[PDB]
Design a protein around this ligand. Structure first.
Ligand SMILES: Nc1cnccc1C(=O)O
Length: 167
């Protein structure tokens, strides 16, 4: 049993909800929250900007030190950093950004990072400001992630379309 409430069960291991991820993290304090990161961990907008704002910029300060030591992530890669006031840990995952011309085949590699964690709260990788089709992102998630993933979908309209169209 876990703390996640109000999710629709899609598969054995994937759950979905219309909830504010920044509000969901604050309520649940999950072991892992996933960030929709870029390779520079520049948390300027979208999930990264909203999560970072909710940490009062402490996520960005920690991320800048990580990049200064390690250099940029790979597209499809990840790193584990603090979850600050939102979670124990934040798994920063870089999905491909279609609005930068990145290979959508890297979305499966991105989701494979989730398999290193038994339970996660996550957004749909590469969706909205990352420019991929969220229906495709949900299909790759279901077909790639084997651990227990609780997906927070921002747009009530998109949530309903994801559920209605789910095979
Ligand atoms: N699920 C979310 C929650 N908050 C902000 C953005 C999103 C998003 O997926 O864009």
């Amino acid at each position: 049993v876990n703390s996640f409430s109000g999710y629709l069960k899609l598969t054995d291991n994937v759950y979905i909800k219309n909830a504010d991820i920044v509000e969901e993290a604050k309520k649940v304090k999950p072991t892992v929250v996933v960030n929709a990161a870029n390779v520079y961990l520049k948390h300027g907008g979208g999930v990264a900007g909203a999560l970072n704002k909710a940490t009062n910029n402490a996520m960005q300060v920690e991320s800048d030190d990580y990049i200064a030591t390690n250099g940029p992530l790979k597209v499809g890669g990840s790193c584990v950093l603090s979850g600050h006031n939102l979670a124990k840990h934040c798994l920063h995952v870089v999905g491909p950004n279609v609005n930068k011309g990145e290979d959508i085949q890297l979305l499966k590699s991105a989701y494979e990072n989730f398999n290193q964690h038994e339970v996660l709260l996550a957004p749909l990788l590469s969706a909205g400001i990352f420019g991929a089709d969220p229906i495709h992102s949900l299909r790759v998630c279901v077909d790639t992630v084997r651990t227990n993933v609780y997906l927070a979908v921002f747009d009530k309209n998109l949530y309903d379309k994801l559920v209605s169209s789910f095979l």
